[PDB]
Amino acid sequence: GSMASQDVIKNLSMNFAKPLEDCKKEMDLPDSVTTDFYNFWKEGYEFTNRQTGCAILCLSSKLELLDQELKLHHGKAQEFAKKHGADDAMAKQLVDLIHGCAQSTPDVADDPCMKTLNVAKCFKAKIHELNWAPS
Template sequence: MARLTILVALVALAIGVSEIDSSADTMKDLTSGFLKVLDECKKELNLPDDIINDFYHYWKEDYSLLKRDTGCAIVCMSKKLELIDTSGKIHHGNAEDFAVKHGAADDVATKLVAILHECENTHDAIEDLCMKALEIAKCFRTNIHQLNWAPKMDVIITEVLTDV
């Protein structure tokens, strides 16, 4: 369940890239939509305020995601956005719809869900849902960087914080 949640969360972070030139804006919209439920999850899970640091630095390839709390936040946000199904797997339809709603072309949304699904399968053996979410998040980030679709997180975080 956690891996699907994580994958869906990551899909939400990266889903809207139809062209490299417009990827930053699309990814910004997707990530902003996903992060809007972070505060709710922080309160619900009693997470520390500094959890935002992992999301701020998420797209930096050399940044290590090591905090279990970050994985738990990803799982929580994915559940709230209905990006995972009752078995904890990525809900492909909802994840694709989320991506399209936030500016992704249909084919891009499908590709992002496929990447998440592949990452989910790669880390299937991890039993701790929060840690599994972290590993899926790292896998997803690597794949998105390989496609040159990674957004600039400082722009995303600034916009999200402005909306709060």
């Protein structure tokens, strides 16, 4: 039931991306981020720039998933996923993949936008490896 799990990731993505218009107008982002989001789950797609990372951070903030240091509320992320239909196990697995990626991607430039973009790419790869990437 890989298709069922893909459908969960699709639902999470769409709900995650709802505040995007609000974010685009609220920060004046180049529509390259719009295109990065259009193509997000497309394999072989490389991401143009950092502003997409700032956009991901904006989305997370609108959903109240970030602390003041712009780090992910782990528990709140897990609850987000379950409220949108992931079972407890999947929700935990998803947060773990993100945490594993955050650790693998060391913040050296002190740039949360680039950091978040790099965590997003790692997460994307892990999700593809599980066959959980939707169309």
